[PDB]
C-alpha cells in the first residue's frame, strides 16, 4: 500500500513531501499530471477537495493541502517530536523554512522587470534573517538535530532548504559553520543519502524553457 503522489513532474510544493517520505524510508509512487486533461480528470472525479494538487493517496484518504499532508506523514512515521512543546518548536521552525523556500522558488516566476530586485531581497532574507536564526538554534544547544536531540521532520525540511540556498548562491552558506556541519551530517543518514543519489525520485530545478513551456501547456 504505497502512498501515491499526484503532482506535476517537478519540485513545486510536492518536493517537501517527497523528502519527508524518503527520509522516513517510505516507498511511494507518483502519478504525474502531464496535461490539462489529467488535471481536469482529477477534479471531475471528485479527488481534489479544493481542485488543487498536491494530493496524496494514503491510508484511504485523498489528502490535499501541503501542510496537512506533511503533518499527517510526520505524525505517522514519528517525525513530529514527542509532545506539544516540541511540536511548537518544530512548527515554528518549519514555517520559517517554508516561508524562505517559497520566496526562493517564486523567483523563476517573477516578471523579468521585477526579478533582479526579488532575487536580492531573497538573498538578503537568507543571509540576514533565516540562516542566522537556524545557526543560532544549533548554537543554543550544541546538539546534532534541531529539536529534541533526535531526528524530526524539521531537520529534513532544513536540509532541503540548504540545498536550494546552495543552488541560489553557494556563498550564502559560507558564514554559517554549524549549518555547514549539520548539512553534512543529515546528508549522511542512510535514507537521505539514498534520496540524494542519482536515479531517486528527487526532482531538479526547472529551467526557463521548461517553466515557460509548462505555463503554456496549462494555465500559469
Ligand X SMILES: N[C@@H](CCC(=O)N[C@@H](CS[C@H]1c2c(cc3ccc4cccc5ccc2c3c45)C(=O)C(=O)[C@@H]1O)C(=O)NCC(=O)O)C(=O)O
DSSP 171: G
Contact 5, 28 (CB under 8 A): yes
- Residue closest to 26 by CA, chosen among 203, 195, 196, 198: 195
Tell me, residue by residue from 49 to 68, as one string, x for binding to ligand X by CB under 6 A and - for no binding.
--xxxx----------xx--
Tell me if 65 contacts its own copies by CB under 8 A: yes
Torsion of CA 5, 10, 16, 19, to 10 degrees: 80
Residue 63 makes contact with its own copies by CB under 8 A: yes
Cell of 209: 524553457
Query: Any known ligand binding at 52?
Result: yes
Q: Which residue has the cell 517564486?
A: 106
From its own copies, ligand X, none, interface partner of 151 (C-beta below 5 to 8 A by class):
none
Q: Taking CB under 8 A as the rule, does residue 68 contact its own copies?
A: yes
- Smaller CB separation from its own copies, 72 or 195: 72
Strand partners, 29: 4
- 66 SS3 class: helix
- 102 touches ligand X (CB under 6 A): no
Q: Which of 202, 194, 154 is nearest to 19 (CA)?
A: 202
> From the list 94, 101, 126, 152, which residue makes contact with its own copies (rule: CB under 8 A)?
94
**Which residues would be at the binding site for its own copies (CB under 8 A)?**
49-51, 59, 61, 63-68, 71-72, 75-76, 84-85, 87-88, 91-92, 94-96, 99, 129-130, 133
**Which residues would be at the binding site for ligand X (CB under 6 A)?**
8, 10, 12-13, 51-54, 65-66, 95, 99, 109, 206, 211, 214-215, 220
Amino acid at each position: 500500500g504505497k502512498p501515491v503522489l499526484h503532482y506535476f513532474n517537478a519540485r513545486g510544493r510536492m518536493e517537501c513531501i517527497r523528502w519527508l517520505l524518503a527520509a522516513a524510508g517510505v516507498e511511494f509512487e507518483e502519478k504525474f499530471i502531464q496535461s490539462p486533461e489529467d488535471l481536469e480528470k482529477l477534479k471531475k472525479d471528485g479527488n481534489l477537495m479544493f481542485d488543487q494538487v498536491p494530493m496524496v493517496e494514503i491510508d484511504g484518504m485523498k489528502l490535499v493541502q501541503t501542510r496537512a499532508i506533511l503533518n499527517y506523514i510526520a505524525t505517522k512515521y514519528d517525525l513530529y517530536g514527542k509532545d506539544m512543546k516540541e511540536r511548537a518548536l518544530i512548527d515554528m521552525y518549519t514555517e520559517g523554512i517554508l516561508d524562505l523556500t517559497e520566496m526562493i522558488g517564486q523567483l523563476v516566476l517573477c516578471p523579468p522587470d521585477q526579478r533582479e530586485a526579488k532575487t536580492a531581497l531573497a538573498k538578503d532574507r537568507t543571509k540576514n534573517r533565516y540562516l542566522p536564526a537556524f545557526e543560532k538554534v544549533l548554537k543554543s544547544h550544541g546538539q546534532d538535530y534541531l529539536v529534541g536531540n533526535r531526528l524530526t521532520r524539521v531537520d529534513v525540511h532544513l536540509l532541503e532548504l540548504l540545498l536550494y540556498v546552495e543552488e541560489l548562491d553557494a556563498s550564502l552558506l559560507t558564514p554559517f559553520p554549524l549549518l555547514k556541519a549539520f548539512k553534512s551530517r543529515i546528508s549522511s543518514l542512510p535514507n537521505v543519502k539514498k534520496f540524494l543519489q542519482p536515479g531517486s525520485q528527487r526532482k531538479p530545478p526547472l529551467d526557463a524553457k521548461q517553466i515557460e513551456e509548462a505555463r503554456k501547456v496549462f494555465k500559469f
